[PDB]
Amino acid sequence: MLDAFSRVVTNADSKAAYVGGADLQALKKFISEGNKRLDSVNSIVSNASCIVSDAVSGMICENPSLISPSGNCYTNRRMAACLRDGEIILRYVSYALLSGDASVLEDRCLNGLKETYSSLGVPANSNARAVSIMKACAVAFVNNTASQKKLSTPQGDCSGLASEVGGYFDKVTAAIS
Amino acid sequence: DAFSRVVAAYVGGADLQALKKFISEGNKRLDSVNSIVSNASCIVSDAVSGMICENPSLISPSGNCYTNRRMAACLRDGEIILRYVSYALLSGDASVLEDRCLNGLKETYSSLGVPANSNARAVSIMKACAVAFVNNTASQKKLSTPQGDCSGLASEVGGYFDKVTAAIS
Amino acid sequence: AMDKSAKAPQITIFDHRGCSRAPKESTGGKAGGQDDEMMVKVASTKVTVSESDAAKKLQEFITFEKGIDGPFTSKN
Amino acid sequence: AMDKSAKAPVITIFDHRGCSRAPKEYTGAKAGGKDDEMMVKAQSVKIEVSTGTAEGVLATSLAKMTK
Ligand SMILES: *C(=C)C1=C(C)C(=O)N/C1=C\c1[nH]c(/C=C2\N=C(C[C@H]3NC(=O)C(C=C)=C3C)C(C)=C2CCC(=O)O)c(CCC(=O)O)c1C
Ligand SMILES: *C(=C)C1=C(C)C(=O)N/C1=C\c1[nH]c(/C=C2\N=C(C[C@H]3NC(=O)C(C=C)=C3C)C(C)=C2CCC(=O)O)c(CCC(=O)O)c1C
Ligand SMILES: *C(=C)C1=C(C)[C@@H](Cc2[nH]c(/C=C3N=C(/C=C4\NC(=O)[C@H](C)[C@H]4[C@@H](*)C)C(C)=C\3CCC(=O)O)c(CCC(=O)O)c2C)NC1=O
Ligand SMILES: *C(=C)C1=C(C)[C@@H](Cc2[nH]c(/C=C3N=C(/C=C4\NC(=O)[C@H](C)[C@H]4[C@@H](*)C)C(C)=C\3CCC(=O)O)c(CCC(=O)O)c2C)NC1=O
Ligand SMILES: *[C@@H](C)[C@H]1/C(=C/C2=NC(=C\c3[nH]c(C[C@H]4NC(=O)C(C=C)=C4C)c(C)c3CCC(=O)O)/C(CCC(=O)O)=C2C)NC(=O)[C@@H]1C
Ligand SMILES: *[C@@H](C)[C@H]1/C(=C/C2=NC(=C\c3[nH]c(C[C@H]4NC(=O)C(C=C)=C4C)c(C)c3CCC(=O)O)/C(CCC(=O)O)=C2C)NC(=O)[C@@H]1C
Ligand SMILES: *[C@H](C)[C@H]1/C(=C/C2=NC(=C\c3[nH]c(C[C@H]4NC(=O)C(C=C)=C4C)c(C)c3CCC(=O)O)/C(CCC(=O)O)=C2C)NC(=O)[C@@H]1C
Ligand SMILES: *[C@H](C)[C@H]1/C(=C/C2=NC(=C\c3[nH]c(C[C@H]4NC(=O)C(C=C)=C4C)c(C)c3CCC(=O)O)/C(CCC(=O)O)=C2C)NC(=O)[C@@H]1C
Ligand SMILES: [Cl-]
Ligand SMILES: [Mg+2]
Ligand SMILES: [Mg+2]
């Protein structure tokens, strides 16, 4: 558990929580791979709008009926809700990657989610493709093998963290598919 | 004439056949336009983000993107500029770009205090984006375009960005 | 002259050859070929960005990360 | 459980080593090194998406789809 974020993760208040200085020094030895882990989270959440929009637009170009008049992304209201869900899921995955634990993702995002989507008729095959595109985006940002000049971080091998974040997306896929 | 009146016009079928007779390289040109327009959100975001990461004082309390109101206007302006450049490439002409976007724009930005070196950098990052999309060498690619050379169209769109740069720098 | 309205050309390119949604918006008849399943739409629309959306973008921008393309040029 | 609030943990990773804007928000103990110039922020925020964003994704999807 990240104790400073206990009220964040239970939605107990809307107050920001801050971990810097000696609290951050200790956080990076509590979690593993601390500097690379925080870099990995940064590269995903700083690109969140594009990851979600590309994933939803990709889900739709593979299955255009989603924005036909009978499709579950038809109208600005439904499209906004779908984009919003994509971001909610991405952000819970980013918190699993920050903390190195899937528990908050499982407990506060996935538990009961499939039953909600079943009640509403939110198409699970399409939802699974949105999640798999978001997964592919996150893995490419974390395990980015371009040259040093194109990277924001000191070059090194982050394939381990890419596999780890991949497994959190797989927990989403198993829960909602 | 239809697009002129507008600038909705819905040009398909025989009207589209006619449209591609009066613009050079019509099929390639519409591929080039779509490669920019369909990716416009990432182009504007990457250009404003890159402007700011090269000069973070733009979002300090004295910077011209400080406050959500100013940032919104800046993101908007990036999109407006990219739309007029895209329409120049669609039409094969700079006249609407010059008349409706650029004429008077520097005077407006000078009165407002919108920083011209920062603005020039946002435009230059959008230019690099658009060149790569036209040539299909951006990181996100279109899969199934007939292979051929669009370096003439990439040069042409580069020239529209350069008109923007010249007008505002 | 730049007229300060924030309106700009909004282009949509539909290369919808083979699309099962039938075309119904063209006005000049048929080419008798694949132009009949494709369209360029141009509108003149005001460009607007909400303040809440700008706040979302600032929360991304302020950490000085980038996309896959381009050199990293930040010094922060 | 998923509580239907549309809230999520918004994480902001501030690695601002070398930054002239002084740290102030974090008031805990100092590390005495580069960790004093870096911070993880997290906040429970209701996630919202605008009509403009939804319209932009719709336009992208129409332009990128084919059949
Ligand atoms: C094929 C791709 C699709 C499948 C499969 C599906 O279920 N929907 C598909 C496409 C689709 N098209 C629209 C809307 C529009 N398409 C056009 C362009 C076509 N109209 C024409 O007249 C011609 C050529 C002569 C075309 C090509 C336009 C103008 C619209 C209206 C929307 C607009 O942006 O102006 C949709 C949206 C839902 C709908 O209207 O059916 C979808 C998903
Ligand atoms: C350096 C990069 C910058 C230059 C140059 C400049 O002009 N502004 C720069 C940075 C800058 N930071 C903020 C805002 C915040 N920074 C933090 C994180 C730091 N606070 C700390 O306590 C520590 C470490 C112990 C940090 C690192 C926080 C939390 C904020 C507040 C905003 C937030 O999003 O929560 C800005 C924004 C304008 C300002 O407040 O100065 C900028 C541009
Ligand atoms: C419809 C024609 C259609 C799409 C829309 C598109 C969707 C799609 N996108 C990927 C993969 C990636 N997208 C990425 C996103 C981004 N990169 C950036 O630099 C910006 C900030 C951000 C927004 C555009 C990334 C990083 C990837 C992964 C790398 C790669 O390109 O694959 C996929 C592939 C998903 C898969 O691997 O399963 C798809 C489907 N494709 C379309 O067909
Ligand atoms: C701040 C840390 C920071 C940035 C932000 C970044 C800015 C930057 N971007 C480029 C160049 C390009 N960006 C592109 C954008 C996109 N490609 C895609 O696939 C997605 C959809 C979209 C959004 C991310 C592209 C296509 C390019 C050109 C790539 C190429 O030529 O192949 C640059 C270079 C600008 C220059 O050449 O003048 C910069 C600096 N860098 C940062 O440090
Ligand atoms: C995969 C994730 C990346 C990659 C990452 C690397 N980062 C390295 C070092 C490093 N990163 C940070 C910043 C980090 N620590 C924090 O405390 C915070 C925020 C609170 C962040 C964002 C630091 C301070 C360091 C160490 C100092 C330095 O070297 O600058 C790193 C090199 C060290 C190591 O291998 O452990 C790597 C490889 N590298 C990549 O190529 C992929 C894309
Ligand atoms: C640079 C832009 C690209 C490149 C482009 C090429 N496109 C070619 C042909 C082609 N493109 C389309 C689609 C286009 N026409 C339309 O009317 C609309 C939408 C309204 C669009 C999006 C068509 C119909 C065709 C003709 C071939 C076909 O039947 O598919 C093309 C071939 C040469 C030519 O036709 O001039 C090229 C070279 N190719 C590249 O490699 C760069 C990246
Ligand atoms: C972003 C890359 C810039 C930035 C831009 C700002 N622009 C601001 C205001 C503004 N911009 C325009 C021109 C715009 N309106 C049009 O109708 C057309 C073209 C047809 C364009 C290109 C106008 C007329 C105005 C003032 C009126 C308005 O706000 O709508 C602006 C707001 C400044 C202020 O309120 O303080 C900003 C921040 N700022 C930057 O730092 C980068 C370089
Ligand atoms: C996008 C990839 C999908 C898609 C999404 C839809 N979701 C809609 C509604 C909906 N989603 C949730 C789950 C969300 N709220 C939470 O609090 C959390 C986690 C903590 C999550 C992940 C709920 C509770 C609801 C119903 C209540 C609500 O909307 O606030 C939705 C319907 C929206 C509407 O009609 O208003 C859609 C369209 N749809 C797709 O086609 C793809 C697969
Ligand atoms: Cl990419
Ligand atoms: Mg458990
Ligand atoms: Mg950094």
Curated annotation (Swiss-Prot), chain B:
Positions that bind (2R,3E)-phycoerythrobilin 2: 64, 69-70, 74
Residues where N4-methylasparagine is found: 64
Pfam families given in the database record: Phycobilisome
Domain of life: Eukaryota
Amino-acid positions noted as binding (2R,3E)-phycoerythrobilin 1 in the UniProt annotation, renumbered to this chain: 42, 46, 53, 121, 139-140
Database matches in InterPro entries: Globin-like_sf, Phycobilisome_asu/bsu, Phycobilisome_asu/bsu_sf
Post-translational modification: Contains three covalently linked phycoerythrobilin chromophores.
CDD domains the UniProt entry points to: PE_beta-like (cd14767)
GO BP annotation list: photosynthesis
GO cellular component, one term: phycobilisome
Membrane topology reported for the UniProt record: Peripheral membrane protein
Location within or outside the cell: Plastid, Chloroplast thylakoid membrane
Keyword Nucleotide-binding: no
Binding site for (2R,3E)-phycoerythrobilin 3: 20, 27, 31, 146-150
Sorted UniProt keywords: Bile pigment, Chloroplast, Chromophore, Electron transport, Membrane, Methylation, Photosynthesis, Plastid, Thylakoid, Transport
SUPFAM superfamilies, per database record: Globin-like
Additional record remark: The light-harvesting system in Cryptophytes contains phycobiliprotein complexes. Unusually they are composed of either phycoerythrin (CPE) or phycocyanin (CPC) but never allophycocyanin (APC), with only one type of biliprotein being present in any one species. Unlike cyanobacteria or red algae these proteins are not arranged into higher-order phycobilisome complexes, and they are found in the thylakoid lumen.
Similarity-based family: Belongs to the phycobiliprotein family.
Subunit structure: Heterotetramer of 2 different alpha chains and 2 identical beta chains. The subunit composition could comprise any combination of 2 out of 4 different alpha units with an invariant beta unit.
Name of the protein described by the UniProt record: B-phycoerythrin beta chain
Organism: Rhodomonas sp. (strain CS 24) (Chroomonas sp. (strain CS24))
UniProtKB/Swiss-Prot annotation, chain D:
Subcellular compartments: Plastid, Chloroplast thylakoid membrane
Further comment: The light-harvesting system in Cryptophytes contains phycobiliprotein complexes. Unusually they are composed of either phycoerythrin (CPE) or phycocyanin (CPC) but never allophycocyanin (APC), with only one type of biliprotein being present in any one species. Unlike cyanobacteria or red algae these proteins are not arranged into higher-order phycobilisome complexes, and they are found in the thylakoid lumen.
Role description: Light-harvesting photosynthetic tetrapyrrole chromophore-protein from the phycobiliprotein complex.
UniProt similarity note: Belongs to the phycoerythrin family.
Name of protein: Phycoerythrin alpha-3 chain, chloroplastic
Binding residue positions for 15,16-dihydrobiliverdin: 19, 21, 25-26, 41
Span list, region Disordered: 18-37
Superkingdom of the source species: Eukaryota
Residues modified to 5-hydroxylysine: 4
Oligomer status and interactors: Heterotetramer of 2 different alpha chains and 2 identical beta chains. The subunit composition could comprise of any combination of 2 out of 4 different alpha units with an invariant beta unit.
Whole-protein coverage range: 53 to 106 of 128
Post-translational modification: Contains one covalently linked 15,16-dihydrobiliverdin chromophore.
